[PDB]
Design a protein around this ligand. Structure first.
Ligand SMILES: O=C(O)CCC/C=C\C[C@@H]1[C@@H](CC[C@@H](O)CCc2ccccc2)[C@H](O)C[C@@H]1O
Lengths: 36, 329, 201, 274, 114
């Protein structure tokens, strides 16, 4: 259990602003074709 | 060892807090909101004698499969409403079903701890029997591989042609209720009765990340179309959007008028809308970015048990305990 | 078109399946390990007065049963077997019965309560609950057994009035009148359902 | 002392009651269908639909008759209107009685022997029974047309029924006796079945007993004078019989039964009222 | 993260809850005697309503909950390990899997020796 936490704590994390921008860009790009 | 676990938990929480500088709601404040979405029922499918427990759309966007309490697995042609197949099950306690991407195989399972796989060329083709608890969800990777999740706190990757458990995924502390496969078909997620979702690597077989922000059992899970986020629905009447790269919760979809859990979660084709099936006999369509309820789907006489969105996004199929399956457009 | 013909054939098969399915009464058998549930997934099918009963006993999964119990929402009745001999584990049985009775998804299912191993209780009484001292037996047919029955009925009538009913029964290890009691209780349950439908409850 | 106001008030009350009954019945059938076959709900739906349609058609024809100043000569050259009005009256009278009798029979079966009712009946038999009752009612209505005789216009100059104010051959007597006997048999079967159900329930029980008593009393009180008068007319030659006022104070006391059926069967329950 | 930290061990056992809305769930106090299995001890609802105790501790124990401080107190006056457990779902008047070997929403527990 401790080894799993140690492994999960040793990753690189991307700032929330970049993730939100990517989600917004994907939604804007693909909104034109969505039938709903 | 408990003190060390607390130390790494605190370190993870601190890193997550430092990584989060802004919020999704703050960014999604200058964009136009989605107008009032009113989706009408175009087709209704009848024939199930009892409550429908699960369903799965086909990869051809036309045929679908639905399993009911009467031990019936019915494959419908959605366009003309005409029934294509009807398979009787050995046990009438089915909890899930699946449709192979090639459209040749169909899998189900339930309280018998058996993953039954039928060949549509309808005789049973395989019985994967390695689990200790009830099988809650099974998804098809290929005609020779399948991924299942059981109530014994484990997931599994089975090779169909042999019938053996190629890989086993452990780490959950409660019954696993749902799983979703990434579009790349190399990573997936699993939600359990532990208020924690986890990300598994299919090839590696080890858990990469765990996201825990919920408060109660997670009943459903779905993956973002671009493969870098996922939304989970739980028993605390909330949905939550988690991001893979930021490894943190992004938005919470809930209103101060719902006191019932979510039994099904799915996205739209572009991901702008998030559809959540509730136990209040109705479904809600949220704006996945603005976190505002854009619409309500009503017309079911019992709780919505399964909900799915067509591959091309032209329809949404909801199956409830009212023994009726409704297609909305 | 052949597709419509196949649909019609499947519809006829489903009508026949509905006809056979509506005539079989499904029951769920629950109880602790010490309680003799066997003597009363394992599926046992029996026939009483040309009526078919199918009782399912689930014992293959783990002890966390708040999720797979929802699969038994439309069951006709829950046959709940309690080992009335063991006083130490009696409170555990009471808690299980209360959780079953007050469940949201099982708030409309009646419970046929069997109090097994009455011979052991009778032997034990003849040479845990402080409330037993200030208790007197009611004017019923022919004290500890009636006390336990009242303890279960207190939870039974505490909540859910007019939605479902609890039917106590005193069964020995060699009592063969269990099928008749199950049939009578199912008949009363069907009568209650008909009455509720006829009054638009 | 005859006016269209009676007709229009009976019309509007009947349509309003039946519309509310149909709405609440649809809601209740949606709620109750996914627990068992709702035979009682289906039979009540048939009853309220029949009452609604009969009220609408017969009242519309009566209003048309009143509006034409009872000038029955110059609008029915072939007397097709009289035949249609008589057919509608006979159907709207016979169908509710038989439907009530069948509902009472089904309720008695489902109360006295519930397990046999649930296992060996199914909804297909109920649908066939309802359709057969409707077809039998329409066939008995069509019988005079299918024969040689035709519906005559009654002495009130406002409705068409069997040939009463005349000493005709055996055909008119046969038809009058047939209608009266069918009505009395339906009333007796309903009374017996409701009494059996109430006796069994006495030994939600109070609500059912009260509803059964109300059904029995309403049906008997509001349907006995009309059938008794028709029996007296048929058995006699109308030389020593009743007058037009009694017949009219019996068409108008039947119409009240038709109005009160949806109130007494559905809308008066505690769950519906709340 | 659903966290329930127990402390204490007449006694005044305390259970501090974090990670969820405290005044929305029905709480239980459970014990495990050494060499035995889990046994339910006491139960309190979400608003100080009807309180349940096991037969052996009726009257002798008291249980309270401070919703403002999001804490659960058990005042006692046998030797066992005590836990505070939560109902799986909110807005519900029943706890199903509280007395289980592996429960996800149960605290670590404190030892009490007499
Ligand atoms: O001119 C007068 O005043 C009387 C003339 C009557 C002519 C039509 C009555 C109509 C009623 C029809 C109800 C319907 O159920 C028939 C009842 C019935 C069937 C069978 C045998 C007896 C009676 C409507 O409600 C309103 C209107 O009055």
């Amino acid at each position: 259990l401790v080894e799993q936490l140690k492994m999960e704590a040793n990753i690189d994390r991307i700032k929330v602003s970049k993730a939100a921008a990517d989600l917004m860009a994907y939604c804007e790009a693909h909104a034109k074709e969505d039938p709903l | 060892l408990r003190q060390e676990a607390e130390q790494l938990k605190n370190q993870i929480r601190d890193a997550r807090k430092a990584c989060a500088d802004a919020t999704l709601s703050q960014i999604t404040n200058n964009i136009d909101p989605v107008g009032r979405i009113q989706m009408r029922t175009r087709r209704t499918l009848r024939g199930h004698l009892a409550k429908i427990y699960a369903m799965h759309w086909g990869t051809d966007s036309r045929l679908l499969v639905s399993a009911s309490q009467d031990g019936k697995l019915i494959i419908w042609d959605s366009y003309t409403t005409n029934k294509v197949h009807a398979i009787p099950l050995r046990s009438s306690w089915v909890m899930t079903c699946a449709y192979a991407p090639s459209g040749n195989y169909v899998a189900c399972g339930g309280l018998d701890n058996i993953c039954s796989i039928y060949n549509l060329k309808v005789r049973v083709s395989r019985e994967l029997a390695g689990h200790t608890g009830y099988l809650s969800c099974c998804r098809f990777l290929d005609d020779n591989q399948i991924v299942t999740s059981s109530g014994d706190t484990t997931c599994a990757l089975w090779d169909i042609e042999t019938g053996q458990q190629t890989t086993t995924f452990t780490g959950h502390t409660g019954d696993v209720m749902s799983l979703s496969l990434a579009p790349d078909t190399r990573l997936f997620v699993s939600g359990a009765c532990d208020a924690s979702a986890k990300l598994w690597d299919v090839r590696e077989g080890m858990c990469r990340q765990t996201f825990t922000g919920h408060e109660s059992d997670i009943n459903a899970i779905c993956f973002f179309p671009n493969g870098n986020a996922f939304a989970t629905g739980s028993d605390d009447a909330t949905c939550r959007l988690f991001d893979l790269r930021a490894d943190q919760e992004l938005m919470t979809y809930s209103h101060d008028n719902i006191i019932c859990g979510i039994t099904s979660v799915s996205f739209s084709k572009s991901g702008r809308l998030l559809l959540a099936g509730y136990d209040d006999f109705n479904c809600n369509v949220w704006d996945a970015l603005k976190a505002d309820r854009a619409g309500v789907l009503a017309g079911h006489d019992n709780r919505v048990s399964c909900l799915g969105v067509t591959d091309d996004g032209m329809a949404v199929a909801t199956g409830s305990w009212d023994s009726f399956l409704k297609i909305w457009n | 078109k052949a597709a419509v013909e196949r649909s019609k054939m499947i519809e006829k098969q489903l009508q026949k399946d509905k006809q056979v399915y509506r005539a079989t009464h499904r029951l769920l058998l629950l109880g602790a390990d010490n309680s003799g549930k066997s003597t009363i997934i394992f599926e046992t099918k029996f026939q009483v007065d040309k009526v078919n009963f199918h009782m399912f006993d689930v014992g293959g999964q783990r002890d966390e049963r708040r999720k797979w119990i929802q699969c038994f929402n439309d069951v006709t009745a829950i046959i709940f077997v309690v080992d009335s001999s063991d006083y130490n584990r009696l409170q555990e049985a009471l808690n299980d019965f209360k959780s079953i009775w007050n469940n949201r998804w099982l708030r409309t299912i009646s419970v046929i309560l069997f109090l097994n191993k009455q011979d052991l209780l009778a032997e034990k009484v003849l040479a845990y609950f402080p409330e037993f001292a200030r208790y007197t037996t009611p004017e019923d047919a022919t004290r500890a057994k009636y006390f336990i029955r009242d303890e279960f009925l207190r939870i039974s009538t505490a909540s859910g009035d007019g939605r479902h009913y609890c039917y106590p029964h005193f069964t020995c290890a060699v009592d063969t009148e269990n099928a008749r009691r199950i049939f009578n209780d199912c008949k009363d349950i069907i009568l209650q359902m008909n009455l509720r439908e006829y009054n638009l409850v | 002392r005859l006016s269209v106001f009676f007709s229009v008030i009976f019309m509007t009350v009947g349509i309003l009651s039946n519309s509310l009954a149909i709405a609440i019945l649809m809601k209740a059938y949606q709620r109750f269908r996914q627990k068992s076959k709702a035979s009682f709900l289906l039979l009540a739906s048939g009853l309220v639909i029949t009452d609604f349609f009969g009220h609408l058609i017969n009242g519309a024809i009566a209003v048309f008759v009143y509006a034409s100043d009872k000038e029955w000569i110059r609008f029915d050259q072939s007397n097709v209107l009289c035949s249609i009005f008589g057919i509608c009256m006979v159907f709207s009278g016979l169908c509710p009685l038989l439907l009530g009798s069948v509902m009472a029979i089904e309720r008695c079966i489902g109360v006295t022997k519930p397990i046999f009712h649930s296992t060996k009946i199914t909804s297909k038999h109920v649908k066939m029974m309802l359709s057969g009752v409707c077809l039998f009612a329409v066939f008995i209505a069509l019988l005079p047309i299918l024969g040689h005789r035709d519906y005559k216009i009654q002495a009130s100059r406002t409705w068409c029924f069997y040939n009463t104010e005349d000493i005709k051959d055996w055909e008119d007597r046969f038809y009058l006796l047939l209608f009266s006997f069918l009505g009395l048999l339906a009333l007796g079967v309903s009374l017996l079945c409701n009494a059996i159900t109430g006796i069994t329930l006495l030994r939600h029980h109070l609500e059912m007993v009260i509803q059964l008593l109300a059904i029995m009393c309403v049906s008997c009180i509001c349907w006995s004078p009309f059938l008794v008068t028709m029996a007296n007319i048929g058995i006699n030659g109308n030389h020593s019989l009743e007058t037009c006022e009694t017949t009219l104070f019996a068409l108008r006391m039947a119409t009240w039964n038709q109005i009160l059926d949806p109130w007494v069967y559905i809308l008066l329950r505690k769950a519906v009222l709340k | 993260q659903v966290q329930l930290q127990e402390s204490g061990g007449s006694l005044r056992l305390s259970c501090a809850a974090s990670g969820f809305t405290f005044s929305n769930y029905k709480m239980n106090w459970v014990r495990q005697a050494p060499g035995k299995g889990l046994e339910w001890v006491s139960d309190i609802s979400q608003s100080g309503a009807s309180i349940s105790y096991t037969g052996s501790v009726k009257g002798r124990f008291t249980i309270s909950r401070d919703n403002a401080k999001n804490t659960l107190y058990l005042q006692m006056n046998d030797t066992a390990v005590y836990y505070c457990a939560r109902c799986p779902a909110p807005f519900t008047p029943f706890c199903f899997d509280v007395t289980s070997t592996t429960y996800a929403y149960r605290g670590q527990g404190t030892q009490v020796t007499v």
